[PDB]
Amino acid sequence: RQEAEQLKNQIRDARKACADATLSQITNNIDPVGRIQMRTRRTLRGHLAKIYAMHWGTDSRLLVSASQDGKLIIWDSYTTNKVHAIPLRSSWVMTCAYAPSGNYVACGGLDNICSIYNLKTREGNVRVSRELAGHTGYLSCCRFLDDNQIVTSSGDTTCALWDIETGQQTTTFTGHTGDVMSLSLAPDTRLFVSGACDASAKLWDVREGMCRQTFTGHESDINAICFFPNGNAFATGSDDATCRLFDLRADQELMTYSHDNIICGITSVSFSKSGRLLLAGYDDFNCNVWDALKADRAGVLAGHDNRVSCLGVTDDGMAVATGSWDSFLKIWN
Amino acid sequence: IAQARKLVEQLKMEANIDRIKVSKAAADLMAYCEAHAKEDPLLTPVPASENPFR
Amino acid sequence: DEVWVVGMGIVMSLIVLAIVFGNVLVITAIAKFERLQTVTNYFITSLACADLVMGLAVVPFGAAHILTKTWTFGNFWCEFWTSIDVLCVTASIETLCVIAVDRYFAITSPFKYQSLLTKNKARVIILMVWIVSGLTSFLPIQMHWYRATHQEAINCYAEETCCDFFTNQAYAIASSIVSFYVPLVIMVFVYSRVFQEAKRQLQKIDKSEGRFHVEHKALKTLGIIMGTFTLCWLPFFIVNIVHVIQDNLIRKEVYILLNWIGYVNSGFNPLIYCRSPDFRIAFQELLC
Amino acid sequence: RNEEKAQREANKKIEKQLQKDKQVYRATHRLLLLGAGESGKSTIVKQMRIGIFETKFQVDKVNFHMFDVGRDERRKWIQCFNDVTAIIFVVASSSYNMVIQTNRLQEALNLFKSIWNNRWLRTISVILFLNKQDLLAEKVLAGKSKIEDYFPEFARYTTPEDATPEPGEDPRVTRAKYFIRDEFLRISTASGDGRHYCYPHFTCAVDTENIRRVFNDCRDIIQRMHLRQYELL
Numbered sequence: 001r002q003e004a005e006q007l008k009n010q011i012r013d014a015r016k017a018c019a020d021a022t023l024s025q026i027t028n029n030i031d032p033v034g035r036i037q038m039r040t041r042r043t044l045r046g047h048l049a050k051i052y053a054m055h056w057g058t059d060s061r062l063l064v065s066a067s068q069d070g071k072l073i074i075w076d077s078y079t080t081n082k083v084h085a086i087p088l089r090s091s092w093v094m095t096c097a098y099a100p101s102g103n104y105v106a107c108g109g110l111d112n113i114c115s116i117y118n119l120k121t122r123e124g125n126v127r128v129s130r131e132l133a134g135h136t137g138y139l140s141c142c143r144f145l146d147d148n149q150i151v152t153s154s155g156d157t158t159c160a161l162w163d164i165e166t167g168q169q170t171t172t173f174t175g176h177t178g179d180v181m182s183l184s185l186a187p188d189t190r191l192f193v194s195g196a197c198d199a200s201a202k203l204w205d206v207r208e209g210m211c212r213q214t215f216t217g218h219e220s221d222i223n224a225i226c227f228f229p230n231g232n233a234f235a236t237g238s239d240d241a242t243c244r245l246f247d248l249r250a251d252q253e254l255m256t257y258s259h260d261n262i263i264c265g266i267t268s269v270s271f272s273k274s275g276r277l278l279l280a281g282y283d284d285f286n287c288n289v290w291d292a293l294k295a296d297r298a299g300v301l302a303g304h305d306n307r308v309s310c311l312g313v314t315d316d317g318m319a320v321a322t323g324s325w326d327s328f329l330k331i332w333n
Numbered sequence: 334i335a336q337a338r339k340l341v342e343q344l345k346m347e348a349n350i351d352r353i354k355v356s357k358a359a360a361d362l363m364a365y366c367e368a369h370a371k372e373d374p375l376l377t378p379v380p381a382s383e384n385p386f387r
Numbered sequence: 388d389e390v391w392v393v394g395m396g397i398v399m400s401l402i403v404l405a406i407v408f409g410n411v412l413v414i415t416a417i418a419k420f421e422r423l424q425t426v427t428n429y430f431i432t433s434l435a436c437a438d439l440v441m442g443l444a445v446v447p448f449g450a451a452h453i454l455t456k457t458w459t460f461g462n463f464w465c466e467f468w469t470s471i472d473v474l475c476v477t478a479s480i481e482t483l484c485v486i487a488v489d490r491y492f493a494i495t496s497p498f499k500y501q502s503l504l505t506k507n508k509a510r511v512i513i514l515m516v517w518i519v520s521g522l523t524s525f526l527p528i529q530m531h532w533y534r535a536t537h538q539e540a541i542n543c544y545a546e547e548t549c550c551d552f553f554t555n556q557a558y559a560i561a562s563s564i565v566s567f568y569v570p571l572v573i574m575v576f577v578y579s580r581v582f583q584e585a586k587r588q589l590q591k592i593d594k595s596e597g598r599f600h601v602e603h604k605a606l607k608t609l610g611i612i613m614g615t616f617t618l619c620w621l622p623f624f625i626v627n628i629v630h631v632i633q634d635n636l637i638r639k640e641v642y643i644l645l646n647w648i649g650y651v652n653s654g655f656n657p658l659i660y661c662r663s664p665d666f667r668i669a670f671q672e673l674l675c
Numbered sequence: 676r677n678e679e680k681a682q683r684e685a686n687k688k689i690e691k692q693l694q695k696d697k698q699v700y701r702a703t704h705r706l707l708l709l710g711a712g713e714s715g716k717s718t719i720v721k722q723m724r725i726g727i728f729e730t731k732f733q734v735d736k737v738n739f740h741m742f743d744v745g746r747d748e749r750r751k752w753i754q755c756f757n758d759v760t761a762i763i764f765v766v767a768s769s770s771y772n773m774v775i776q777t778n779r780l781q782e783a784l785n786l787f788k789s790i791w792n793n794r795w796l797r798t799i800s801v802i803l804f805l806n807k808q809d810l811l812a813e814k815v816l817a818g819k820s821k822i823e824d825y826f827p828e829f830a831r832y833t834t835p836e837d838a839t840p841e842p843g844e845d846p847r848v849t850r851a852k853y854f855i856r857d858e859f860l861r862i863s864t865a866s867g868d869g870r871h872y873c874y875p876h877f878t879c880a881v882d883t884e885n886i887r888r889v890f891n892d893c894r895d896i897i898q899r900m901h902l903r904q905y906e907l908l
């Protein structure tokens with residue numbers, strides 16, 4: 001235990017010595033983006049109960065959402081139509097994902113099983129492709145590396161990498177003290193980071209299978225995670241009102257996003273296409289838009305009767321869709 | 334017992350790494366944002382003709 | 388005197404402005420926000436639409452009639468205005484009855500209420516209410532089934548400069564019954580049963596947590612709900628049935644005064660049926 | 676072209692299916708069977724049956740759906756059970772002298788305090804089942820560890836003036852049962868604001884009428900919610 005304390009002290013000292021000047025000082029001369037006016041272009045209706053998770057398709061047109069009613073609906077954002085409506089074995093669902101190829105949709109929740117649905121089948125409209133089991137906790141988030149690999153983050157404090165064809169855990173990742181509540185993949189897909197209830201965000205290497213870096217930051221749990229579009233930084237959301245941005249190379253916090261009025265938590269975080277805007281949902285009924293490089297609020301997104309539980313920015317950066325507990329999906333621009 | 338050794342080894346693995354100065358990292362993020370701000374439909378108001386949802 | 392006419396005009400203008408403002412605010416609040424779109428809120432907005440129609444049609448033209456002391460418009464316009472007035476009054480009172488019945492089904496049978504009230508069912512109920520209201524108003528007035536065989540009435544129906552209300556016994560009795568008396572007894576039974584349910588829940592709570600600290604509220608709410616409807620409309624229908632029988636002569640001024648006392652119920656309604664915290668938040672958001 | 680027509684037809688079919696599913700979903704209630712371990716939750720669940728465990732039972736032509744979750748003191752998944760009809764809390768009332776280190780009853784009281792004060796579980800009534808009444812009666816009646824040894828407030832406790840006992844019982848077992856009930860009721864009363872209440876019940880393994888108790892408690896919960904919505908309570 002003595003060696004661990006010395007190693008932690010050395011790591012903290014190295015991080016402190018590496019900190020030459022904070023990001024706020026350097027980005028002082030950058031012109032602020034100014035006030036941003038954003039309105040609900042289309043509202044997607046049909047969900048029975050509250051919506052937890054959503055994911056934009058690679059086509060930037062199709063998005064899939066999950067609700068506690070047991071319905072997994074795939075929407076056509078441009079035409080506001082329902083392409084598919086997949087029932088689920090377990091009503092309680094806390095995650096969903098849409099494959100990069102556009103053919104597979106993943107789901108999971110309190111059922112402790114990651115369900116994968118094949119959308120390309122012609123004999124049946126939608127059917128379960130695999131029943132990925134082995135976790136002993138609720139699946140907080142699932143993401144697709146490709147059409148044949150998936151990475152999940154469960155309540156077992158472990159993130160696991162699965163193989164679709166064979167159907168078992170190829171690699172598992174351990175080290176989190178508390179439950180893993182979010183997961184986001186790097187653009188190159190060789191790396192990913194997972195926020196945990198242990199007030200620590202960790203970076204994992206998919207191919208090697210070993211954790212690389214750990215960031216302390218705040219003291220409350222992490223609910224949201226998202227890489228910078230560059231793939232070299234990421235931002236976290238907390239049960240505490242603080243929203244923080246970390247850097248992989250500097251291995252420490254760069255800037256923190258918080259306000260005196262806000263005392264609620266953060267449930268969803270995503271970046272704009274150019275990375276200038278950090279759209280972050282809140283336990284409060286409204287969403288917020290932060291200037292990533294200056295930590296100055298730009299715009300406020302409001303119009304949800306309940307807490308915002310999901311949020312995402314499409315691949316081409318044209319629209320933002322936030323799914324709240326009001327059982328409504330609102331697409332902004 | 335055995336968990337402590339694993340935690341110590343994990344901390345040792347994270348300790349041995351090269352960290353570049355925060356000035357360079359902030360410059361890199363600022364340069365990326367400045368370079369790619371021209372193709373961000375959210376940051377700047379896209380025309381209604383080019384807006385797909387409108 | 389001369390000041391009296393100006394005062395009456397100012398009072399009528401204030402009344403119509405209040406009615407229009409309140410009802411349009413309620414309708415806008417319900418329409419703008421999808422949160423307020425609720426099955427009972429469909430009945431609420433039907434009531435608001437009926438009250439707005441009454442305050443926009445019957446109240447201003449009636450005020451012009453009482454101030455001018457004659458009807459400047461055509462003979463067809465008198466019949467149309469009377470039809471609109473009767474339709475609005477009947478629709479408003481029957482919508483009050485429907486709201487009461489909906490609350491009865493909500494508290495009395497909580498399990499089955501969520502299944503046998505739906506958006507389609509609510510729309511069917513509202514359409515049926517408005518059709519029933521229309522048949523009592525438009526069908527007799529337009530086809531002249533309400534016209535009475537009286538010398539003064541026959542003289543009034545001829546000259547187009549006078550537009551008063553003279554009605555036969557049968558139509559007046561039927562219209563008063565359908566408009567007010569059936570909804571009155573239905574709402575009385577409904578609210579008595581709901582008060583019984585609230586009281587028994589209160590005694591159950593007291594038995595459960597008597598030692599620890601945790602029917603005034605129910606009585607106050609039912610008073611503010613039923614008294615403002617009974618006190619506003621009961622005298623008008625009472626004197627209607629009375630003078631129609633002609634046993635006790637009623638002056639026309641008293642009739643008009645009681646009719647307008649009934650009219651102001653449209654303005655009073657939003658202050659009684661829109662005190663919910665969601666409605667208050669919506670009103671605060673809309674105005675400042 | 677034809678893509679718009681195909682999308683419209685698909686949306687219409689999916690909307691009809693969703694309307695049917697919405698009717699079926701609103702016609703059924705949901706309950707969360709949440710309680711401490713080895714407290715008899717399995718026994719009571721089997722009595723009502725007649726990763727997660729879901730059991731569906733209907734009484735008086737009303738559909739009830741129950742979910743039992745199975746893994747640490749921290750509960751972030753508890754936010755998934757907002758807007759449920761009720762939370763069924765089963766506790767081994769006889770385990771006033773046990774180690775769960777800590778008294779089992781004290782741990783259950785702490786769990787009840789955490790659930791009652793949870794922000795997301797607000798406006799959610801809790802149905803309380805004081806399971807294992809017979810074991811409690813056997814313990815208190817026989818010469819054994821006293822309640823005052825583990826719960827200091829029991830010495831100053833007195834039997835409430837309500838004094839509603841069963842057909843046959845002893846004064847000591849009645850005092851113990853009512854003190855155990857009143858601890859939970861005192862925890863429940865302070866934090867509540869009239870939105871949600873706690874319904875206590877003394878049940879045993881022999882009893883098999885708990886379906887009726889759950890049905891009546893749910894009926895009272897929905898009735899009280901409706902009455903408070905209209906401001907008549």
Ligand SMILES: CN[C@@H]1CCc2c(ccc(O)c2O)[C@H]1O
Nearest residue numbers: 469472473476477552562563566
């Ligand atoms: C012109 N004033 C009318 C006369 C009779 C009448 C009214 C309202 C409802 C009815 O059921 C009636 O029979 C009054 O508003």
